[PDB]
Amino acid sequence: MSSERTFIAVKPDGVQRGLVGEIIARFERKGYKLVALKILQPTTEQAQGHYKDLCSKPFFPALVKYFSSGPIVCMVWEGKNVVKSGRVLLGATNPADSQPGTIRGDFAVDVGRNVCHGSDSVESAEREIAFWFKADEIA
Amino acid sequence: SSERTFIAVKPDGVQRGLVGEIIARFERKGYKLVALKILQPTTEQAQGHYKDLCSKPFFPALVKYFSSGPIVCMVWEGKNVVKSGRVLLGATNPADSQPGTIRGDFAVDVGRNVCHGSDSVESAEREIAFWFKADEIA
Amino acid sequence: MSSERTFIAVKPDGVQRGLVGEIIARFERKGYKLVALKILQPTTEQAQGHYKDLCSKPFFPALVKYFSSGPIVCMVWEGKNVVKSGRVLLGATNPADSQPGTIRGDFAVDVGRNVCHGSDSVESAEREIAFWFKADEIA
Amino acid sequence: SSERTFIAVKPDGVQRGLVGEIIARFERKGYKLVALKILQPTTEQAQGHYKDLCSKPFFPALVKYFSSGPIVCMVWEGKNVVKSGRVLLGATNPADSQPGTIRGDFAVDVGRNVCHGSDSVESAEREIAFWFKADEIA
Amino acid sequence: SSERTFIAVKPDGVQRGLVGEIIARFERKGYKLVALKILQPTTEQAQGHYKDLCSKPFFPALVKYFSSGPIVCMVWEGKNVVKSGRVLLGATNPADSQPGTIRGDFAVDVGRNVCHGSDSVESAEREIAFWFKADEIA
Amino acid sequence: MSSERTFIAVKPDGVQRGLVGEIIARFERKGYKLVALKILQPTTEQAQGHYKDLCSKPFFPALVKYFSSGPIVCMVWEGKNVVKSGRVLLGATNPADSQPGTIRGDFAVDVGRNVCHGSDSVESAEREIAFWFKADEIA
């Protein structure tokens, strides 16, 4: 379906390093349609809710602290097969596994600093979109 | 210093996939993004944006075009960000613009000039207040 | 052999979306030599002849119609191993399978809109070159 | 409007792998490619191109250099495409050219200035007629 | 002709990951790299570089900043490389610089202007002698 | 370890073709730290020492001659996992095997002209660094 949607975020390292435009540009070049957009610094509560499945893991406090350390950019992209293509564009979540040509492949080294997040599935996309955006924020 | 300017990617700029390019140029310049949203302007919003030209010809055509599709609204912060913004966009009329600028690289026609930037600090403050709530600025 | 040649075309979507220069540039950057070049809008007959092996398939009329819908750019490139490298540069024919870094990986989403065509073999290259170009059009 | 200009990538521009870059800048500008071919100019073609300078010194050297290897001939269409073409290429003499332009980015020497663009609509029409048949324009 | 100029990426230019970009622009321009090294300037080196301004205010702040981290020193060779270098970098004061130039694209503040280029052949020869031994030039 | 280091060189073809800045830029963009840098034309002795493990191979004289034919750029990069990421960035040593997105994938065709060299392991990196640089040349 052409109306498939995904959630993409530029993380605080990606924003600090001036990678917002580059990421957005790669999605535009790919041919996908931006339908929602905002910049904000996550609260602790937001960072914890985002990483809620991993809340029992020992590296969780560092993830939450880092994620809430500065502004992120939230996006929603629309188009056919946009979820899978989004993940492919960002590259393997561990930059050590990422291919050049991808966002993480080109720009990231450390997994706790992997620049940007993309939904891993349609269910996850729906959850993340609903988490970060009210329905009325989506154009 | 903590100076802020307003930049919008107009419907033509969004349609041609130029949003990321424009953001990237400001980032590369060393400026800090403090506000961002995408929307299709209402008639009222479009009229407000062009309020100064309401007694000029084809005000309705300009208003109609600007409300015809989504724009991207941004606020950027940094020393001389207003002036630098104007320099980066290039002359408002693309025909007078130099390559290396946004309009210089991507636009031909003043009617389709991709983007808009505040022409002054005063104008910046007006536009920023128009498009964003106080609570929308990080 | 250094004199190996391939046929590359920018399809109507690729031309409309202003991707001609980008594709050409990637071939120049790779180090290959452009020896033939033209722009034209295929006739129905040309589009059908191009897709002649698939003429019994139900999506054939759409392929022919689309391919003849606007100008394409025809090219011939020369150099060692140019056929395989050409296909690798364009990426998987189905953009869903294409890797970032490639033309289709970077720019295309839908298979009926895959931006650009490259010969899949030396035999095919010879056929396509001969189809689109007279010998005297090749510099 | 339906204005057309002629652009050629000279042998130096082709050799340095700059054809795609130059095409890309016109595409990004929003212009429409209506004619395209690659060839090594004959002596006669090179003399015709430089016909106005035939009584100037080293006419044979210029002619010899231009026929020394392939050029890419193009015709581009759009409002102000001639003027915009000149602006995009930058000053004919690279020493006077600004970065952001083709000559500004890639050339140093007027003798090796990568590309040529028509200096006028009249000149465009002459060059277009010189390099292309009516039936070669889409 | 066999003219040479000196270019340095200052600590801010190195920190922001701009070394490759700057080298690439000279390469694309058609110039030849003849010398290259990375180092953190000593106090003495920084004082020597800014020797002409030693009786001007905040000489110590400029010296301290320049010795605060690594710079990249380069020597480039080619016809008009000095002038072309100045043109490529853009106005020393980023506020007066045009997009398409290094400072035009990446800098806002004269105090953080990414890079330095010799302002003259005389200055080039002085700087080249200052930063490189004869035996370091290829 | 964050202090891992690798040796990267732009070969004479890469320097002649103006690829120095591009390569350096990809390493900067990836987030690695340049700690040593110089340009020089290898002597015959240097080229032979560099290729010393292959000195009995018949294509050795051509490798040595080519490598000593013009200036190369020597570099040392520092950062976590920098060796593996360096090789991944350069791409397969045989350009026929290299992926678009990589240096060799984007720019090289022939294996005797593969533009640039990167250490294949930490041991090799230490050897190459020590070969090309005195300790006091590393910042």
Three-state SS string across D44-78, please?
HHHHHHCHHHCCCCCHHHHHHHHCCCCEEEEEEEC
Amino acid residing at C139: A
Window B:48-87, CB contacts with E under 8 Å: 78-80, 83-84, 87
CB A36 within 8 A of CB A75: yes
Active-site residue identified among A14, A48, A91, A117 = A117
3 state SS of E94: helix
3 state SS of F5: strand
The candidate with the shortest Cα–Cα distance to F115, out of F105, F125, F101, is F105
CB C101 within 8 A of CB C43: no
Instruction: Give F66: exposed, middle or buried? Use CB within 10 Å, 0-12, 13-18, 19+.
Output: middle
Q: Is the dihedral of CA D79, D21, A29, A25 positive or negative?
A: negative
Letter string b/e over residues E6-39, b meaning 16 or more CB atoms within 10 A of that residue's CB: bbbbbbbbbbbbbbbbbbbbbbbbbbbbbbbbbe
CB E3 within 8 A of CB E77: yes
By DSSP bridging, strand C116-118 and strand C5-10 are antiparallel
The separation between CA D33 and the C-alpha centre of its own chain, rounded to angstroms, equals 14
Domains and CATH numbers, chain F: 1-139 (3.30.70.141)
In the PDB record, what is the listed experimental method? Answer: X-ray
CA distances from A64 to A54, A131, F134 (A): 10, 16, 44
Q: Is A29 annotated to bind ligand?
A: no
C-alpha to C-alpha distance for F40 and F71, rounded to whole angstroms: 5
CA triple E94-B81-F33, angle to 5 deg: 60
C-alpha to C-alpha distance for C42 and C58, rounded to whole angstroms: 20
Residues in chain A that come right before a backbone break, where C and next N are over 2.5 Å apart: none
Nearest to D100 among B98, B107, B109 (CB): B98
How many residue contacts between D and E have a Cβ separation below 8 Å?
39
Window D:90-109, CB contacts with E under 8 Å: 95, 98-101, 104-109
C-alpha to C-alpha distance for D58 and D69, rounded to whole angstroms: 18
End-to-end CA distance of chain A: 18
Give the pair of three-digit tokens for residue E107: 């800098």
CA distances from E118 to B118, D43, D128, E74, E123 (A): 36, 43, 44, 11, 6
Q: Is the dihedral of CA C125, C130, C131, C133 positive or negative?
A: positive
Instruction: Give C124: exposed, middle or buried? Use CB within 10 Å, 0-12, 13-18, 19+.
Output: middle
C-alpha to C-alpha distance for C103 and C27, rounded to whole angstroms: 11
Are F20 and E21 in contact (CB < 8 Å)?
Answer: no
The separation between CA B44 and the C-alpha centre of its own chain, rounded to angstroms, equals 17
Amino acid residing at D131: W
The candidate with the shortest Cα–Cα distance to F76, out of F40, F41, F35, is F35
E strand or H helix at B116 = strand B115-117
DSSP C102: B
C-alpha to C-alpha distance for C63 and C67, rounded to whole angstroms: 6
| Beta strand spans in chain F (E) | 5-10, 33-40, 72-78, 116-118
Letter string b/e over residues E64-100, b meaning 16 or more CB atoms within 10 A of that residue's CB: ebbbeebbbbbbbbbebbbbbbbbbbbbbebbebbbb
Q: Is C67 annotated to bind ligand?
A: no
Would you call B49 a catalytic residue per the annotation? no
Nearest to D29 among B98, B100, B105 (CB): B105
